[PDB]
Amino acid sequence: KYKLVFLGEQAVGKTSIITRFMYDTFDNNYQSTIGIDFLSKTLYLDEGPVRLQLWDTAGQERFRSLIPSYIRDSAAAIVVYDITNRQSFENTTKWIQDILNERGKDVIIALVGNKTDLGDLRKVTYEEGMQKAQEYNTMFHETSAKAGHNIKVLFKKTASKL
Ligand SMILES: Nc1nc2c(ncn2[C@@H]2O[C@H](COP(=O)(O)OP(=O)(O)O)[C@@H](O)[C@H]2O)c(=O)[nH]1
Ligand SMILES: [Mg+2]
Q1: Which residues does GDP bind (predicted)?
Q2: Using CA atoms, how far apart are residues 126 and 136, in angstroms rounded to an integer?
Q3: Nearest-atom index, ligand 1, CA of 115
Q4: What is the CATH T-level fold of the domain 1-162, as seen in this structure?
């Protein structure tokens, strides 16, 4: 079993990405919520099966004292932002630092730009996201939980190198 924690500002798409991967579905009528959740899934890689334990967190500032417990013992950490929201992107550094403080080098980190189906509303370029990821040597991906685009490769890459 490997603990994968999802971090990021409220409403960027953490719950939706997780749902998309778990049941390959999307709630088009889903109106943002506050809460935490745990879900695990087994992925079969051309090397053997890998059990993943996904932690869906609550990123609002009022829950900051819970961050250490979110990240503790994690094998991987996904920092998610919204490509249409500049402020959610500016906060990625904060989340990446929380990860480094708590786990140092013993964790795989991935930076994800979500909501790629709203390209017309993009406020953060792919370039910017990629540079941030390169600054901290993390993985970089842009996804769309709504359309269900480029999400499976994210979990496959994490489950493979970990
Ligand atoms: N257009 C679009 N909306 C999305 C996408 N992912 C999530 N959303 C919507 O954005 C809102 C916030 O998503 P949610 O998963 O609750 O965010 P969380 O706070 O990170 O868990 C919801 O109303 C979702 O339906 C996406 O890829 N595209
Ligand atoms: Mg959520």
Answers
A1: 11, 13-16, 30, 115, 117, 145-146
A2: 16
A3: 27
A4: Rossmann fold (3.40.50)
